[PDB]
Coordinates of C-alpha atoms and ligand atoms in Angstrom, one line a residue:
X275 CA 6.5 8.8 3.4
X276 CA 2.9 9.1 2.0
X277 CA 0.0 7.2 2.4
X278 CA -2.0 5.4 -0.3
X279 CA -5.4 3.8 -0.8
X280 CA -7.1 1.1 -2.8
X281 CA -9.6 2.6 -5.2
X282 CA -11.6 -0.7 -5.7
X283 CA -11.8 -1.1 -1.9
X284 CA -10.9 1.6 0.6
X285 CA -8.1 0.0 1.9
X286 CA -5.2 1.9 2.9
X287 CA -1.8 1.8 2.9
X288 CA 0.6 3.3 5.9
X289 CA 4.2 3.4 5.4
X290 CA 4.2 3.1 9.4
X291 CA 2.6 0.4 10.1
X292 CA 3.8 -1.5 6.6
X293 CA 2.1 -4.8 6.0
X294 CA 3.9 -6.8 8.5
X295 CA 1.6 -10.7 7.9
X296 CA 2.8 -10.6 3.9
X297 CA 6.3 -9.5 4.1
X298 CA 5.9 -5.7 4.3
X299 CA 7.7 -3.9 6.9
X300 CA 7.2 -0.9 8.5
X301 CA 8.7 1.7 7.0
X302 CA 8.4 0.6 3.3
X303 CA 7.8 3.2 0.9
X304 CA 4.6 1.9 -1.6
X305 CA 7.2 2.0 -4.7
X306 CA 9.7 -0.3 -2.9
X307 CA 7.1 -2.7 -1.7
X308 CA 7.5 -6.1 -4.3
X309 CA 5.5 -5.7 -7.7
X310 CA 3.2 -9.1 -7.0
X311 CA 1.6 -7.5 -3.2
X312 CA -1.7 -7.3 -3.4
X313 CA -4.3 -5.0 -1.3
X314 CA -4.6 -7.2 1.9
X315 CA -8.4 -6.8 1.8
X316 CA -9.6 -7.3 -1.9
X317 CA -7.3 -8.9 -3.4
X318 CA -6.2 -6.7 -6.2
X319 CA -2.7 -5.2 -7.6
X320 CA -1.1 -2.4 -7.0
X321 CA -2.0 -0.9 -10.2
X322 CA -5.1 0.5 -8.7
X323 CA -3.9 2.1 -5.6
X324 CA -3.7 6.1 -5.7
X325 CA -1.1 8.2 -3.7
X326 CA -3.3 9.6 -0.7
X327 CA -1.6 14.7 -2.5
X328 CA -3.8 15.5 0.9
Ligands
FE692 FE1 -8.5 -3.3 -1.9

C-alpha cells in the first residue's frame, strides 16, 4: 500500500495513518479514497498527487 504526495504542496499521503478528520480511514488505498477529497493542507484535488515508485 504505497504512499503518495501532493506536488503543489508537500503533503503526503499514508495509507496507515489514512485521513481519519475527513472520512479517510486507515488503511485506504489512494484509488479507493472518494474522487471529491482534497489534500488536507492546500486544498487541491487529487489530480495532482504523484505515487511516492521509491
Ligand atoms: Fe497539498
Amino acid at each position: 500500500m504505497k504512499k503518495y504526495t501532493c506536488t503543489v504542496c508537500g503533503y503526503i499521503y499514508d495509507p496507515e495513518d489514512g485521513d481519519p478528520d475527513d472520512g479517510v480511514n486507515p488503511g485506504t488505498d489512494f484509488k479507493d479514497i472518494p474522487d471529491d477529497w482534497v489534500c488536507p493542507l492546500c486544498g487541491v484535488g487529487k489530480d495532482e498527487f504523484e505515487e511516492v515508485e521509491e
